[PDB]
């Protein structure tokens, strides 16, 4: 049973909201639907993608709900689906919208080591999420339109992020880092947030797999990024839940009351395992592990509804650090956020993992 199509059909039929703001998770979900278009060759999937993005992309290429001057790295992620649409349809408005997003990169603020700040409102901060939204989009953009020298910038951002956010003990990477060490959530020694959040690691491993894929084969930092991906996978396999074969919201604290197996991070990790094996970044010996983990996603997180469609359950709706609610990154904080079903932050990665599983 091909869950990529079944889930795509479920998303469309259940009319999951993908149009209420310029949300990174909406492009992510559409990126999953685009894989279903690719293999089915069924225009209804492409048409759904087009119709969804018509909310945002005006004929003149301006983007509803986007403001460049906010310098929000999340706002770049939806450029990835725009690349796909431009390649598929050749429509100029998508290219103009892409030019507008690329202009953000010109002056988006950077840390002392030249990594994009997560947002203007988060000065001096690197969050793992941003590597997927920003650096990874930038890589896809450069592959299509850019100058190859720009890949050096992108790879440097991955390398510096691993240097600053990695825990030497576990090999896992913390959710966020404040170079200025001024945020109350940031460790006075290291600037790091307190915990390993499942979805944050998921963002980083997806970002690695998707970025390495578009690098020139001879790129000077290609092996370094592959090594980082292997190291992340090693670290994640150490904390995989033995019974379920999936991952917890707070990755290394599975025995702690309140923690839970979380669908979006688990799906992202399974996608990266599968894609990493397919492209040769990870050893072929991991194939059965990856397959078993995929089946674990279905077992733990998928339920059939009476109409024969499916729900994806147990998705952390949102998490972050600081901000108006002064989010402190404690265990209690990560457990406090909503757990929801049929949320695009989980749906997209589940579609993508399904596509990779089916391809294997």
Short mmCIF file of C-alpha atoms in Angstrom, two decimals:
data_model
loop_
_atom_site.label_atom_id
_atom_site.label_comp_id
_atom_site.label_asym_id
_atom_site.label_seq_id
_atom_site.Cartn_x
_atom_site.Cartn_y
_atom_site.Cartn_z
CA UNK A 1 0.00 0.00 0.00
CA UNK A 2 1.55 3.30 -1.13
CA UNK A 3 1.08 5.75 1.69
CA UNK A 4 2.46 8.69 -0.29
CA UNK A 5 -0.63 8.74 -2.51
CA UNK A 6 -3.03 7.72 0.24
CA UNK A 7 -1.83 10.57 2.43
CA UNK A 8 -1.84 13.07 -0.43
CA UNK A 9 -5.42 12.08 -1.22
CA UNK A 10 -6.28 12.43 2.49
CA UNK A 11 -4.78 15.92 2.73
CA UNK A 12 -6.71 17.07 -0.34
CA UNK A 13 -10.03 15.50 0.68
CA UNK A 14 -9.82 16.70 4.31
CA UNK A 15 -9.00 20.19 2.97
CA UNK A 16 -6.11 20.71 5.35
CA UNK A 17 -5.34 24.41 5.67
CA UNK A 18 -2.29 25.41 3.64
CA UNK A 19 -3.28 28.98 2.77
CA UNK A 20 -3.75 31.10 5.94
CA UNK A 21 -0.25 32.58 6.16
CA UNK A 22 3.12 32.28 4.39
CA UNK A 23 4.02 29.23 6.41
CA UNK A 24 7.12 27.13 5.76
CA UNK A 25 5.21 23.97 6.60
CA UNK A 26 2.81 24.56 3.71
CA UNK A 27 5.57 24.51 1.08
CA UNK A 28 6.97 21.46 2.87
CA UNK A 29 3.64 19.62 2.51
CA UNK A 30 3.41 20.67 -1.12
CA UNK A 31 6.98 19.40 -1.69
CA UNK A 32 5.67 16.00 -0.52
CA UNK A 33 2.66 16.23 -2.82
CA UNK A 34 5.03 17.07 -5.68
CA UNK A 35 6.67 13.65 -5.25
CA UNK A 36 3.25 12.03 -5.65
CA UNK A 37 2.79 14.04 -8.86
CA UNK A 38 6.22 12.82 -10.02
CA UNK A 39 5.44 9.12 -9.69
CA UNK A 40 1.72 9.06 -10.46
CA UNK A 41 2.00 11.57 -13.32
CA UNK A 42 -1.51 12.54 -12.24
CA UNK A 43 -2.20 16.22 -12.96
CA UNK A 44 -4.62 16.49 -10.05
CA UNK A 45 -1.62 16.67 -7.67
CA UNK A 46 0.10 19.40 -9.71
CA UNK A 47 -3.18 21.28 -9.94
CA UNK A 48 -3.56 21.14 -6.15
CA UNK A 49 -0.09 22.58 -5.73
CA UNK A 50 -0.77 25.35 -8.22
CA UNK A 51 -4.11 26.26 -6.65
CA UNK A 52 -2.61 26.36 -3.15
CA UNK A 53 0.25 28.64 -4.21
CA UNK A 54 -2.14 30.92 -6.10
CA UNK A 55 -3.13 32.27 -2.68
CA UNK A 56 0.39 33.61 -2.26
CA UNK A 57 1.88 34.36 -5.66
CA UNK A 58 0.49 37.42 -7.38
CA UNK A 59 0.81 37.81 -11.15
CA UNK A 60 3.56 40.40 -10.64
CA UNK A 61 5.58 38.00 -8.50
CA UNK A 62 4.93 39.66 -5.14
CA UNK A 63 4.08 37.29 -2.28
CA UNK A 64 1.08 37.75 -0.03
CA UNK A 65 2.04 37.39 3.63
CA UNK A 66 5.76 37.83 2.98
CA UNK A 67 7.78 40.86 4.09
CA UNK A 68 11.44 40.74 3.23
CA UNK A 69 12.40 43.32 5.84
CA UNK A 70 11.31 41.04 8.70
CA UNK A 71 14.36 38.92 7.83
CA UNK A 72 12.59 35.74 8.98
CA UNK A 73 14.52 32.70 7.75
CA UNK A 74 11.30 30.60 7.82
CA UNK A 75 9.96 32.74 4.98
CA UNK A 76 12.48 31.26 2.52
CA UNK A 77 11.33 27.66 2.76
CA UNK A 78 8.38 28.06 0.39
CA UNK A 79 10.82 29.06 -2.33
CA UNK A 80 11.57 25.36 -2.78
CA UNK A 81 8.09 24.57 -4.11
CA UNK A 82 8.36 27.70 -6.28
CA UNK A 83 11.47 26.22 -7.93
CA UNK A 84 9.52 23.05 -8.61
CA UNK A 85 6.60 25.00 -10.06
CA UNK A 86 8.85 27.16 -12.23
CA UNK A 87 10.58 24.07 -13.63
CA UNK A 88 7.26 22.30 -14.24
CA UNK A 89 5.19 25.19 -15.66
CA UNK A 90 7.71 27.81 -16.76
CA UNK A 91 5.36 30.57 -15.50
CA UNK A 92 7.15 33.86 -15.00
CA UNK A 93 5.38 34.84 -11.78
CA UNK A 94 7.11 31.97 -9.97
CA UNK A 95 10.52 33.12 -11.17
CA UNK A 96 9.77 36.71 -10.12
CA UNK A 97 8.67 35.48 -6.68
CA UNK A 98 11.93 33.53 -6.44
CA UNK A 99 13.91 36.67 -7.28
CA UNK A 100 12.09 38.43 -4.44
CA UNK A 101 12.98 35.70 -1.95
CA UNK A 102 16.59 35.57 -3.13
CA UNK A 103 16.89 39.31 -2.44
CA UNK A 104 16.41 38.56 1.29
CA UNK A 105 19.68 36.64 1.29
CA UNK A 106 21.55 39.76 0.16
CA UNK A 107 21.31 41.49 3.54
CA UNK A 108 19.84 38.90 5.91
CA UNK A 109 21.78 39.41 9.15
CA UNK A 110 24.56 37.00 10.07
CA UNK A 111 26.47 35.87 13.14
CA UNK A 112 30.16 36.60 13.62
CA UNK A 113 30.85 33.33 11.75
CA UNK A 114 28.55 34.26 8.85
CA UNK A 115 25.56 32.07 9.69
CA UNK A 116 22.10 33.55 9.08
CA UNK A 117 20.31 34.72 12.21
CA UNK A 118 17.12 32.70 12.62
CA UNK A 119 15.06 35.93 12.47
CA UNK A 120 15.66 39.65 12.95
CA UNK A 121 13.76 39.29 16.26
CA UNK A 122 16.25 36.59 17.31
CA UNK A 123 19.54 38.41 16.96
CA UNK A 124 22.74 36.35 17.18
CA UNK A 125 20.76 33.09 17.22
CA UNK A 126 21.18 29.93 15.18
CA UNK A 127 18.28 27.46 15.40
CA UNK A 128 18.55 24.08 13.68
CA UNK A 129 15.18 24.70 11.98
CA UNK A 130 16.75 27.53 9.96
CA UNK A 131 19.28 25.35 8.21
CA UNK A 132 16.39 23.63 6.45
CA UNK A 133 14.42 26.80 5.70
CA UNK A 134 17.28 29.02 4.59
CA UNK A 135 20.58 27.40 3.70
CA UNK A 136 18.81 24.46 2.04
CA UNK A 137 16.53 26.68 -0.04
CA UNK A 138 19.58 28.76 -0.97
CA UNK A 139 21.32 25.58 -2.17
CA UNK A 140 18.37 24.60 -4.36
CA UNK A 141 18.22 28.14 -5.71
CA UNK A 142 21.94 28.18 -6.57
CA UNK A 143 21.66 24.79 -8.30
CA UNK A 144 19.02 26.26 -10.61
CA UNK A 145 20.01 29.92 -11.03
CA UNK A 146 23.02 30.90 -8.98
CA UNK A 147 26.75 30.90 -9.16
CA UNK A 148 28.37 27.74 -7.83
CA UNK A 149 30.81 29.69 -5.65
CA UNK A 150 27.78 30.45 -3.44
CA UNK A 151 27.71 26.85 -2.31
CA UNK A 152 30.78 27.65 -0.15
CA UNK A 153 28.62 30.01 1.92
CA UNK A 154 25.93 27.37 2.34
CA UNK A 155 28.27 24.56 3.35
CA UNK A 156 30.11 26.83 5.81
CA UNK A 157 26.77 27.46 7.52
CA UNK A 158 26.22 23.73 8.04
CA UNK A 159 29.75 23.25 9.34
CA UNK A 160 29.63 26.15 11.80
CA UNK A 161 26.20 25.05 13.00
CA UNK A 162 27.50 21.59 13.83
CA UNK A 163 30.59 23.09 15.54
CA UNK A 164 28.49 25.30 17.80
CA UNK A 165 25.39 23.17 18.45
CA UNK A 166 26.76 19.63 18.82
CA UNK A 167 26.93 17.83 22.15
CA UNK A 168 30.21 15.89 22.22
CA UNK A 169 28.79 13.32 24.63
CA UNK A 170 25.75 12.12 22.67
CA UNK A 171 26.52 13.49 19.21
CA UNK A 172 23.09 15.11 19.15
CA UNK A 173 22.63 18.83 18.40
CA UNK A 174 20.70 21.19 20.62
CA UNK A 175 17.70 23.07 19.22
CA UNK A 176 19.30 26.54 19.35
CA UNK A 177 22.38 28.63 20.10
CA UNK A 178 22.68 32.29 21.15
CA UNK A 179 26.13 33.56 20.19
CA UNK A 180 25.60 36.56 22.47
CA UNK A 181 24.57 34.25 25.33
CA UNK A 182 22.00 36.85 26.43
CA UNK A 183 18.73 34.87 26.11
CA UNK A 184 17.60 33.36 29.44
CA UNK A 185 17.24 29.96 27.77
CA UNK A 186 20.89 29.99 26.69
CA UNK A 187 23.60 28.22 28.67
CA UNK A 188 26.05 30.66 30.23
CA UNK A 189 29.02 28.58 29.00
CA UNK A 190 27.98 27.42 25.56
CA UNK A 191 25.05 29.59 24.53
CA UNK A 192 23.03 26.45 23.91
CA UNK A 193 19.41 25.67 24.66
CA UNK A 194 18.74 22.90 27.20
CA UNK A 195 17.41 20.00 25.11
CA UNK A 196 17.57 17.87 22.02
CA UNK A 197 14.22 18.41 20.31
CA UNK A 198 13.15 15.74 17.86
CA UNK A 199 11.88 17.99 15.11
CA UNK A 200 14.95 20.25 15.31
CA UNK A 201 17.25 17.31 14.69
CA UNK A 202 14.85 16.27 11.93
CA UNK A 203 15.22 19.66 10.23
CA UNK A 204 19.00 19.42 10.35
CA UNK A 205 19.23 15.89 8.92
CA UNK A 206 16.75 16.69 6.15
CA UNK A 207 18.70 19.87 5.45
CA UNK A 208 21.92 17.88 5.14
CA UNK A 209 20.47 15.22 2.85
CA UNK A 210 18.74 17.77 0.61
CA UNK A 211 21.75 20.11 0.45
CA UNK A 212 24.36 17.45 -0.24
CA UNK A 213 22.14 16.21 -3.08
CA UNK A 214 22.51 19.50 -5.01
CA UNK A 215 26.22 20.09 -4.29
CA UNK A 216 28.80 19.64 -7.04
CA UNK A 217 30.34 16.14 -6.65
CA UNK A 218 33.78 17.69 -6.25
CA UNK A 219 32.74 20.38 -3.79
CA UNK A 220 35.43 20.88 -1.15
CA UNK A 221 32.94 20.56 1.77
CA UNK A 222 30.82 17.71 0.38
CA UNK A 223 32.60 15.01 2.39
CA UNK A 224 32.41 17.10 5.54
CA UNK A 225 28.63 17.40 5.27
CA UNK A 226 28.33 13.67 4.57
CA UNK A 227 30.38 12.96 7.70
CA UNK A 228 28.16 15.26 9.77
CA UNK A 229 25.10 13.43 8.45
CA UNK A 230 26.59 10.05 9.36
CA UNK A 231 27.46 11.33 12.83
CA UNK A 232 23.93 12.65 13.33
CA UNK A 233 22.45 9.32 12.24
CA UNK A 234 24.75 7.42 14.62
CA UNK A 235 23.63 9.71 17.43
CA UNK A 236 19.95 9.39 16.57
CA UNK A 237 20.09 5.60 16.34
CA UNK A 238 21.44 5.51 19.91
CA UNK A 239 18.23 7.16 21.15
CA UNK A 240 15.74 5.41 18.87
CA UNK A 241 12.95 3.87 20.95
CA UNK A 242 13.52 0.10 20.92
CA UNK A 243 9.89 -0.99 21.05
CA UNK A 244 8.39 1.44 18.52
CA UNK A 245 11.46 2.14 16.34
CA UNK A 246 10.65 5.85 16.33
CA UNK A 247 11.76 8.93 18.28
CA UNK A 248 10.70 11.06 21.26
CA UNK A 249 9.87 14.76 21.45
CA UNK A 250 12.81 15.19 23.85
CA UNK A 251 15.13 12.74 22.12
CA UNK A 252 17.33 11.43 24.91
CA UNK A 253 14.78 11.46 27.76
CA UNK A 254 12.47 8.63 26.69
CA UNK A 255 11.98 7.29 30.24
CA UNK A 256 10.79 10.65 31.61
CA UNK A 257 7.11 11.14 32.43
CA UNK A 258 5.46 13.50 29.96
CA UNK A 259 7.71 12.63 27.03
CA UNK A 260 6.09 11.10 23.95
CA UNK A 261 6.87 9.56 20.59
CA UNK A 262 6.53 12.44 18.15
CA UNK A 263 5.56 12.08 14.51
CA UNK A 264 7.11 15.01 12.69
CA UNK A 265 10.66 14.56 13.98
CA UNK A 266 10.40 10.77 13.54
CA UNK A 267 9.21 11.14 9.94
CA UNK A 268 11.99 13.61 9.14
CA UNK A 269 14.58 11.23 10.57
CA UNK A 270 13.21 8.27 8.59
CA UNK A 271 13.24 10.36 5.40
CA UNK A 272 16.88 11.30 5.95
CA UNK A 273 17.85 7.68 6.67
CA UNK A 274 16.13 6.44 3.54
CA UNK A 275 17.37 9.22 1.26
CA UNK A 276 20.86 9.03 2.74
CA UNK A 277 21.04 5.32 1.92
CA UNK A 278 19.63 5.86 -1.58
CA UNK A 279 22.24 8.47 -2.47
CA UNK A 280 25.09 6.52 -0.83
CA UNK A 281 25.69 8.99 2.01
CA UNK A 282 24.82 6.31 4.56
CA UNK A 283 25.83 2.65 4.34
CA UNK A 284 23.52 0.10 2.71
CA UNK A 285 23.64 -1.92 5.92
CA UNK A 286 21.11 0.59 7.31
CA UNK A 287 18.39 -0.42 4.85
CA UNK A 288 16.53 -2.80 7.18
CA UNK A 289 16.79 -0.30 10.05
CA UNK A 290 15.32 2.41 7.85
CA UNK A 291 12.49 0.17 6.62
CA UNK A 292 11.62 -0.92 10.16
CA UNK A 293 11.56 2.69 11.37
CA UNK A 294 9.27 3.64 8.49
CA UNK A 295 6.85 0.88 9.42
CA UNK A 296 7.07 2.24 12.97
CA UNK A 297 5.73 5.57 11.75
CA UNK A 298 2.64 3.81 10.40
CA UNK A 299 2.18 1.72 13.53
CA UNK A 300 2.52 4.61 15.99
CA UNK A 301 1.07 7.56 14.12
CA UNK A 302 -1.36 6.54 11.35
CA UNK A 303 -5.06 5.78 11.90
CA UNK A 304 -7.60 5.05 9.17
CA UNK A 305 -10.81 7.08 9.18
CA UNK A 306 -14.15 5.56 8.22
CA UNK A 307 -13.98 6.92 4.68
CA UNK A 308 -10.78 4.93 4.13
CA UNK A 309 -8.56 8.00 4.32
CA UNK A 310 -5.87 8.40 7.00
CA UNK A 311 -4.90 10.72 9.84
CA UNK A 312 -1.38 11.41 10.99
CA UNK A 313 -1.35 11.77 14.77
CA UNK A 314 1.02 12.89 17.54
CA UNK A 315 2.59 15.93 15.93
CA UNK A 316 4.08 18.70 18.06
CA UNK A 317 2.21 21.74 16.76
CA UNK A 318 4.92 24.34 17.48
CA UNK A 319 8.02 24.85 19.60
CA UNK A 320 10.60 27.60 19.85
CA UNK A 321 12.74 29.60 22.25
CA UNK A 322 12.32 33.03 23.82
CA UNK A 323 9.86 35.34 22.10
CA UNK A 324 6.86 37.04 23.68
CA UNK A 325 6.14 34.03 25.92
CA UNK A 326 9.79 33.78 27.02
CA UNK A 327 9.98 30.11 26.11
CA UNK A 328 12.76 28.62 28.23
CA UNK A 329 13.53 25.37 26.42
CA UNK A 330 13.06 23.30 29.56
CA UNK A 331 11.64 19.80 29.50
CA UNK A 332 8.37 21.15 30.91
CA UNK A 333 8.32 23.73 28.12
CA UNK A 334 8.72 21.12 25.34
CA UNK A 335 5.97 18.94 26.84
CA UNK A 336 3.68 21.98 27.22
CA UNK A 337 3.17 22.57 23.50
CA UNK A 338 0.12 21.11 21.70
CA UNK A 339 0.09 17.62 20.20
CA UNK A 340 -2.10 17.58 17.10
CA UNK A 341 -3.22 15.53 14.12
CA UNK A 342 -3.00 16.37 10.40
CA UNK A 343 -0.56 19.22 10.89
CA UNK A 344 1.59 20.10 7.86
CA UNK A 345 4.84 20.09 9.87
CA UNK A 346 4.25 16.32 10.18
CA UNK A 347 2.33 15.63 6.97
CA UNK A 348 5.07 16.84 4.65
CA UNK A 349 7.85 14.75 6.18
CA UNK A 350 5.54 11.74 6.28
CA UNK A 351 4.81 12.10 2.55
CA UNK A 352 8.52 12.46 1.83
CA UNK A 353 9.49 9.46 3.95
CA UNK A 354 6.76 7.44 2.23
CA UNK A 355 8.07 8.37 -1.20
CA UNK A 356 11.60 7.30 -0.23
CA UNK A 357 10.39 4.05 1.33
CA UNK A 358 8.37 3.18 -1.74
CA UNK A 359 11.33 3.98 -3.96
CA UNK A 360 13.51 1.60 -1.93
#
